[PDB]
Structures are given as structure tokens and as C-alpha cells.
């Protein structure tokens, strides 16, 4: 109790918040999707609803501490509002994302943060052919809203999306689910943007 | 008035908030479900909506006081925002939980906290067979979102879910309702996670069973 | 202006907020319902939607003042967030209550508070028979969420619910509407809880 | 920039917020409705949805300044949260009002405030006959929620509702739209309440 | 880290917030629409739902800094709540705008701000004829809610709306999309108001142009 209280107070109250990465001090965020359910499909609007956990990881020097100075504490939990979090956003949503979990991150003594919120997302997807054997493929890109590749880079720890919690009696079964880093240029903006492309092939069960 | 004001000021203003449990100082939270209503079932999405009270209990040394130092006060009520609460979450929801009550906890002189909010949850459930006599079974796990078994443990005071306030004219009648501690390992994470599994067998309301 | 500003500053800024009632210093809240409209009925879910004003009254010593010390001011209006309010809750709602009005209370020199928000409530009710001549009866209990009878007691000023603002072209007409204090014990909890039971008999017009 | 910053700091930071009108220092609020669209009608619930601007005006001595002391500034814009606003509310709503605009007021050197938010309101209205040539009439009262006629009075600058922005391809055309001050006594309350009654006659196109 | 922290503290904590433009010190905001999807059309209410990015740009002297005084930093990102933003609003919405993105702006050393939120808007539009080959045209004006032309002026960098991110399998295909500055007088108000008029011609997705 006493040690952890002091640690948190030293980090968050006594110094200013991390102001985000820069070209001089860029940052790599690791992303992993754990798909839980394709809830529904709206063929009149081409919107599809997913439930998933999005695991995000990154490391800041300003969150480091020596465990021996603070009661042998190696890690702690804290409200995501107490720390900088990356502005990772789906690029083809049609509604604001619904958060289905507390927003709490895990900070380790080496400055590592793991943050893994559950979300329901409605996104752009034509479900024509979902009732077939072939199924249908849809995709959604996730990346930083304001940070280019020179400030935020993304990687995945694997190309395969974790389907081990996928709801077995979902109305839709997953044929394939991948997550793949991409570099992209858009007419809006001079500098390149990095995303992870979630590609899901699925059909009616 | 005067004594309780001082007690609250001593606890909440004069010291920092409890920063949650750790591997060295873990915590056991007790859970009890009081099921009120199965409001609806959506067979086109396999989502079902429950209304229930979730009673949570735990005990902190940092919330202890001697009643004789504070006007013989044994317990008080306070906004849940004034204290640490455990991050107990349903593991198969499809919408954000709707809170149907004030969020106020009861703190006792021994450091016990009881906190019992009402909620409406939509969760993953195939209702195929609900219109039968047999009914249908669905389940939802409740556990800490970020704390493993080494920091937060769960127990129940009984396997039986309290159905004594269940809405008698619900469209769905409850056949059985249990709540059972489980230990689980997931591919995401090295350390084990504890949940309480709410298992509810229910069917569309009938006038008469079988002969 | 000048007097009222001082009064409010003396009460709310210069002393702590009232921490709620206790067994030693319990409190009585008076409830009165003014039913405006039964908007709809959902027979597929047994939910019914009411619009109503819930008048709440109570009296605190910590809100008293002498009018002669403050420009002859006998009462004032203020945001409900500036004061303690009782945690009166419907016991069989199925959605969070929608507030249809500002949340402003009236405080009188004797420490009386009147607080009278407009609300839309969805609650548990089987409407089977609403299309009949007999109609249908439904009920909903209102009481403190955390305070037992030893801390908060409830009374009504009358058994009859005020229907004088009821929408004349509602789809549902009210046959009867009562509000009745009750004492209750529940298996969860050792001490007794007080509620006011709103009982409404109504039918299609 | 420099002058306006000082003016705002003099008014809002250096003195307390206006605590609302009283019997000794009452206030007149002027109301004007600018009707934009009748979006829809629900005949199964007798609810109708309007989009409109509600222009509110009032004058406080505590917001006066001499332009010559502050760079010749005659008026400025500011967030409505920085000032007291009146609690004018529709008396027969069935959902919370949706705000469709920024909430920003205009303050003039004489202490005048103009505040003119856009809103979507669902309110109690039987649309039976809207498909006829005669059309249908509906009405909704707007008034202070907590201030009686002794504290807040209302007036209009005209009996005619401004239809000059009304959506020309609305599903419903407006036949007539008036706004009329009323004095009212209710069974709840001893003192009189003032409202402006918005009366709209409309039909299908 | 250290330099940027100081820069932000110098600008936002040590001086007061910009109180908005005036007749003496007016401001020009540049607008650019990037249309993503026409999600749906409701012919029973004449409401249509768009998803789009609205790029807003303006320049304040009070946000200038010399890069050489602050570790060679030419620009930074920050929460839109930390700065003044213009009150640009759709003039014929029927619901509150849904924000589909973080609200973060980019500030440059010359005092330039770029702010580009994603939004879903429901607005007044009669879709009669959307199922035809000709399609249907709808329009919505965007302008300052409280600032007249004497305080806020608007311009576009181009008349053409960017459709390069438009969802290719939308239920509705875009035939044309323009954005055009206008000056307007209204019966409410003596002084003129500036808007940019977003005009979109669209139809139900076909599979052939006939
Ligand atoms: O037009 C676009 C689409 C594109 O979407 C992928 C993600 C991106 C990251 N941010 C989010 C806003 C955006 C941008 C800025 C200014 C105008 C339009 C615009 N967007 C996105 C764009 C990239 C780059 C940038
Ligand atoms: O994929 C999962 C499923 C599983 O759900 C039961 C509850 C858990 C408690 N927390 C909440 C998020 C979660 C987690 C972290 C990182 C990636 C995926 C992931 N989840 C849940 C998981 C456990 C562990 C952990
Ligand atoms: O199980 C219940 C039902 C009952 O509902 C009527 C109102 C009450 C006032 N508060 C609200 C929460 C409640 C309570 C506490 C702990 C477990 C279950 C539980 N509830 C309600 C109960 C009473 C008492 C208490
Ligand atoms: O019962 C009512 C209906 C009536 O509605 C018109 C507007 C009014 C202004 N305020 C809003 C709340 C109200 C009031 C106070 C206490 C109990 C009931 C009650 N209301 C409204 C009433 C008036 C007076 C008062
Ligand atoms: O009544 C109106 C309609 C008109 O709508 C187009 C947009 C405008 C920009 N602002 C937003 C509010 C408004 C205004 C001010 C005071 C009373 C009514 C009123 N409005 C809009 C008006 C213009 C001008 C002004
Ligand atoms: C840390 O652990 C050591 C043994 O490794 C133990 O003796 C000590 O109590 C702990 N130190 C602190 C400061 O808690
Ligand atoms: C960065 O560094 C040099 C000096 O080392 C400076 O003169 C230059 O203008 C800076 N910025 C850019 C964009 O090169």
C-alpha cells in the first residue's frame, strides 16, 4: 500500500505528463487483436459490428523506476487517464466506438505499458455473400490519428489474429483473420502513416 | 453530523487513495448476484439483456477506525468515487453496461466495504430453444479486468443466485441460476485469472409445465 | 444580487457538504408524484415508459439562515449539485432514467428543500389486458438505494397521485393512480427498507 | 486580443457568478423561436420531433462595462458555461433535448446577453389529421423550471414565429406558428408561472 | 521530451487563452472536406447520414515560437481542448454530430493550426430520386455559429471535395461533390455570415451507368 502510493505520486503528481512522441524521440506501439464476436451485419447500410480486445504496448523512459527504491514493486495497475496513451483509431468506423471494459493500464518497472480495452466497433463492410460457402471478406485499418510514421510506428507480434476467445455460438464463423502492418500515403498529408490492417473473412454459420 | 464529517475527512482528505492490491498484498472480493429480470432476447444477434444487482465485498486495513474515537459510529455510506472499487467486468458483453442505480458504498469500522450496484447487461447467448419446456442455458463470467489471481481472488458466499426479487411477470422464467468460482488461463496472458461464472437456465413464460 | 451571493458563499463554500443522514441523525423525505404521460408499452419485453415529476422534500439544519442577516431573502434556487440530495431510486427500472429538466432545487430559510425533476422511466410491467375495459395495473417502488429505515424514512402528503397535468391525448388513460408508503425486508439485508409504491391502473383510450 | 482578455478577466475571474434573480431583483427574459423543421411524427406514441433555434435575451448590471476603458469593445462572444443562463424548459417533452449547436452567448457593453442554441425536441402531440388539408395543431409551453413570475418574467418581441429558415423540402409544411406569453397557476405550487406557448399548425406535403 | 514540455508550458500555462477573433483582429479559417461514406438515407424523415473528415486551418500570432529557442522543434500535437478552435457548425443538422476520432490539433512554429476531426452528421435532405440514374443532389452549409463575416471569414483551397478515401462499396456512389464559399444575410441578424456550402450529388449503387 504505502510503497505503491509513493511510486504513483512520484511519477504522476510530481512531474509533467509525457507530451507524446516526436521526430527526435519516436515511439513504437505494438498491436494485437483478440476477436470475440461478429455480432451483426446491416446489409441496408453496409455496416458490421465487431467485439474485440485491442492489446496495445509501448515503453516510456519517463515511467521507469528501480524496484528496490519502492518496496520491491515490479508493476502496477492504473487508470488510463493517469498516463499518455496512443491515439490509435479505426479508419472506417461509422459510429463512435463503444468501450466495454474499464480503461486501466499495466505499467512495469522498465517503463513498459500494456493497455487492452474491449470495444464494439461498427465499420464499413459490404456483407453481400456472407450467406455463401466462400463467405465475405472485410477489412479495417487501425493507426494513429495525428502521428505519422516519423513519430509513431506500429508492429504486430504475429500476423495471426487470436480467435481463441471467439464466441463459439456466434451467428458468424471466422474463416480467416489477419493483422498486417502497412505504410500509406494519402492526398491530404505529405508524410507517411502507419496502420495495422485487420482483415476478417467470415460467413453465416 | 459533526463526528461523521471528521471521520470522512480523516480517511479521504488526509491520506492518499488505496492504489489497489499487489502480489505482496493481495485482496479477496466476494461476489453475489441478485437476478431481477431477463428483459429480452435477440435471436438474430444472440444477445440477451439481464437486469441484476451485483453485490461486491472486500476489506481494507486503510479504512479501519475505532468507533469510540468518532461518536460511536460503526459504519457509513459514501459515493463510490471516494474509494477504490474493484474492476469486476463481464467477459462476454456486447454493449457497455448500463448503471441503473446510484453508485454508493457502505464502509464498516473493521474496513469492510459492501457495494451493490444495479446493472443492465447485454451479453453473448444463443437463445435457441427458449420457447421449449426444457428452456435454454446461458452463461457469463465476471472477473477483474487487469488483476490476475495473484492480486485479486474471488469467492461467493453461496452457489445459488438469489431469485427472490425476480420479476414474476417477466417474459422469461428462471429454471435455475448458479454462480461458481473458476480459475482460467488464456492465450493472451501468462498468469491465471479468476472469475465467477453466472449460469442461468431460462425459458419463455408458460401457464403449466408437463404432466 | 449582493446579499444572495453572500448567503450562498456562507452556506456552500465556507462549511463542508452534509454527509447524509445516520442512525443518530435520521431524515424524512416526502415524495409526491405528478404523472404526465404513459408514452408507450412494449409487450415483447414487458417494459412501460412513464413521464412524471417526482417532488422530493426534506429539511436540513445546516441549510438554515436568518432572513434579516441577508437582505430579507426567504428562499433561493440553486443547482442540485451544490447540495446533498437523497438517493431515491426506482426498484424495477430496465433503463437508466432520462432527466427531462434542469436539476435545480429551491432552498428555504428554515432549511427546507424542494426538488422536483421531470423524468422518463422504463420499468417492469406486463401490459397484457391494456386494450380491455378493465385495463391493467402496474406498480413501481421508489426508495433510498443505500439508506435503511433507520437513516431515511419516506412519507407522502397524500395517497392520490396528481393527474392534473396528465396529457389529455395520451394513447393511455389513467383509471387510478396511488402512492403508498411501505416497509420491506429483503433476504440480502438485515435492516428494513422504506419505499413509496406507485400503483397505476390504465388502459388504451 | 489584449483588451478583450482583460475585460473577460475583470468580469468572470474577479467577481462571483450571478446567483440568479430574486423577488427583490427580478429579471425579464425575451424569447423568440425560429422553426427549422418538423422532422417526424410518431402516431403510435403521440410524439413529434422539432428542430428550432430558441433565441433568449436578458440583461444583467453585473455584465456592464464602459467601451472606452477596454479598447472600444462594444460586445464579445463567450462560452455559455462562463455565465448564468436561464432555465427555460419545454413543459411537455418526452426525451431529453438534443443540442445541435455550440453553446456560445453574445454579451454587449450595456449588460445584454443574446443566446440562441439550436435544439431537437420530442414533445407530446397527437398527429391524427396531419395528412388532411385542415392539418393538425400542436402546442408546447416554454418557461422557467424553478423561477415563478415574481422572479422571472417572459416576453416575446413578436407573436409570429420566424419561419424564414424553415426547411422547404420538409415532409411537413407549416400553416401557422405563433408564440404567446401566458400566466398560469398549477395545483403543485402557490405562486404563478409564466410561459411562452408555441402553437404550430402543420400538415403533410 | 524536455524541450517540447517547456514549449507547451510557455504557451498554454504562462499566458491566457486566445479569446477569439474580433472586428479589429479578424481571422480566416480554411475548410476542406474529405468525404468517406454516405451511410444511409431516411426517406420517411428526409435525413441523410454522412461520414467525413473536416479539415480546419487558421493562424494565431499568440502560438508563434522560434524553433532555435526550443530544441529545433518546428511543430507539435496537442489536445484540441488546450487551444481555441473555431465554432464551425452545419446549418441544417437534425442530430448532434458524432465525433469518430480523437480531437487533436497540430500546431506549427509560425502559429498555424491544422485540426481535422472525423464526424458523422445527419442533415436535412430529400432523397427522392436517389434510386435513379440521375441521382439526387443535397447540400449543407458550414459556418461559424456566432462570428459574422467581420470576425471570421472562410475560404477553401479548392472547389473539389476530396473523394479519394470514399468507401468503394458504400450503398451510395458519389457523382459529384463541391465546396463553395458563400456570403449570406438572414432575417435574424444585421451583419453578414460566411459559410462553405457542401453540395453532393449521389445515387444508389448500380453496377452499370446505362
Ligand atoms: O482523408 C483522410 C483519410 C486518411 O485516413 C487514414 C488515417 C490517417 C491519419 N490522420 C487522420 C486524419 C487524416 C487526415 C488529415 C487531414 C485531412 C484528411 C485526413 N484523412 C486522414 C488520413 C490519414 C492522415 C490523417
Ligand atoms: O482475449 C481476452 C479474453 C479474456 O477474457 C477474460 C478476462 C480477462 C481479464 N483481462 C481483460 C482483458 C484480457 C486480455 C488482455 C490482453 C489480450 C486479450 C485479453 N482478453 C482478456 C482475457 C482475460 C485477461 C485480460
Ligand atoms: O436484491 C435487491 C432487491 C431490493 O430492491 C429494493 C431496494 C432496496 C434498496 N437497496 C438497493 C440495493 C439492495 C440490495 C443490496 C444488496 C444486495 C441486493 C440488493 N437488492 C436491493 C434491495 C433493497 C435493499 C438494497
Ligand atoms: O406538476 C408540475 C407541472 C407544471 O408544469 C409546467 C411548468 C412548471 C414550472 N415548474 C417545473 C416543475 C413544476 C413543479 C414543481 C413541483 C411539483 C410539480 C411541478 N410541475 C411543474 C409545473 C410548473 C411549476 C414547476
Ligand atoms: O434563426 C437562425 C437561422 C440562421 O441559420 C443559419 C446559420 C446562422 C449562423 N448563426 C447561428 C445562429 C443564428 C442565429 C442567431 C440568433 C437568432 C437566430 C439565429 N439563426 C441562425 C442563423 C444564422 C445566423 C446565426
Ligand atoms: C524487499 O525484499 C527483501 C528481500 O529480498 C526484504 O527483506 C524486504 O522486506 C523488501 N524491502 C522493502 C523495502 O520492502
Ligand atoms: C534544425 O537544425 C538546424 C541547426 O542545427 C536549424 O538551422 C534548422 O533550421 C532546423 N530545422 C530544420 C527543419 O532543418
Numbering used by the authors:
A (entry chain A), C (entry chain D), D (entry chain C): 20 to 224
B (entry chain E): 20 to 230
E (entry chain B): 20 to 229
Question: What does the published report state?
Answer:
Protein-engineering methods have been exploited to produce a surrogate system for the extracellular neurotransmitter-binding site of a heteromeric human ligand-gated ion channel, the glycine receptor. Acetylcholine-binding protein is a highly conserved ortholog of the pLGIC extracellular ligand-binding domain (ECD) with properties similar to nAChR. Mutations affecting key residues in the orthosteric agonist site at the α1(−)/β(+) interface affect the potency of both activation by glycine and inhibition by strychnine. We therefore set out to generate a high-fidelity surrogate of this α1(−)/β(+) orthosteric binding site using the 2α1:3β stoich­iometry [Fig. 1(a)] by exploiting protein-engineering methods and the thermal stability of acetylcholine-binding protein from Aplysia californica (AcAChBP). Ultimately, the highly stable AcAChBP framework has allowed us to introduce nine amino-acid substitutions that have resulted in a stable surrogate for a heteromeric neurotransmitter site that binds glycine.
Variant I incorporated five changes: T53F, Q74R, Y110A, I135S and W164F. The key observation from the structure of the variant I strychnine complex concerned the Y110A, W164F and I135S substitutions. Trp164 NE1 donates a hydrogen bond to the carbonyl of Ile135, thus linking two β-strands from different subunits. The electron density of the phenylalanine (Phe164) was poorly ordered, perhaps as the reduction in the side-chain size of an adjacent residue (Y110A) opened up one side of the binding site, allowing a greater degree of conformational freedom. Neither variant I nor variant II appeared to be able to bind nicotine. The combined Y110A and I135S substitutions may open up the binding site such that nicotine can longer bind in an optimal fashion. Variants I and II presented structural features consistent with site-directed mutagenesis and electrophysiological data that suggest interacting roles for specific residues.
